[PDB]
Design a binder for this molecule. Sequence first.
Ligand SMILES: NS(=O)(=O)c1c(F)c(F)c(S(=O)(=O)CCO)c(NC2CCCCCCC2)c1F
Ligand SMILES: [Zn+2]
Length: 257
Amino acid sequence: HWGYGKHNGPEHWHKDFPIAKGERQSPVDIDTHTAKYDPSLKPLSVSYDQATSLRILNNGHTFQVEFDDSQDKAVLKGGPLDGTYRLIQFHFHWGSLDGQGSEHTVDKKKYAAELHLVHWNTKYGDYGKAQQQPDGLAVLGIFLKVGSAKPGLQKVVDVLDSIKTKGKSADFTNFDPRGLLPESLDYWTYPGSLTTPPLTECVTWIVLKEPISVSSEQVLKFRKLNFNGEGEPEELMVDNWRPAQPLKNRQIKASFK
Ligand SMILES: NS(=O)(=O)c1c(F)c(F)c(S(=O)(=O)CCO)c(NC2CCCCCCC2)c1F
Ligand SMILES: [Zn+2]
């Protein structure tokens, strides 16, 4: 139904998901000059040493790497968060051209892509329950710029030909998501939403200031994927990003400056 095309893209989503026009929708433009340094924000605690990746899946919108979230193995804590958030999956958004693709923007600048590590608050017991809560999810967002290759991304890039079309999955064990992080964990944070339907307002966003570098060849492999299923007309999976939404009555906080 929904997608990223002219006929089913972000401008249409409000008809099936009226929260699209809500008070805390994501992504947003991060105006660096209006964000508030908050000295009381804590360093982010990213504890990914025990992470158990399981599978990679083309879901028809993006691809996602999924993790075992049935124990506290890969968790996000600290920062603006109360309590412990377990990593369930990560996915990307990217463009047809290197000058677009990110969902968040920084002083209106678009990056080539954005990585989202999705976590759910363990006080709600499972991710389905967590999505129904205003503090249910925490998504760690990381910008990708085109330059030098990111060695820790290559394992992901190399399996994409085996999940070209919607509904294809592959085993994807022993992947270390620590290899996708930049040097610094300085971040902005604000309360928002899922950026795909159902657009639920259940997300604390934590967006890292420091992008990672990926090579032009790595991002060209993302653009080889297909939105369509096997045996259907080929539609390249590109421009799977929602544009910035109105900030409304929100303040973006910075952990730095
Ligand atoms: N940008 S985002 O982090 O809000 C987002 C997506 F863009 C997204 F595409 C997905 S997806 O890969 O699973 C595809 C469409 O759902 C999730 N995943 C979460 C949201 C969906 C419901 C379950 C809560 C945890 C997964 C998702 F959280
Ligand atoms: Zn996302």
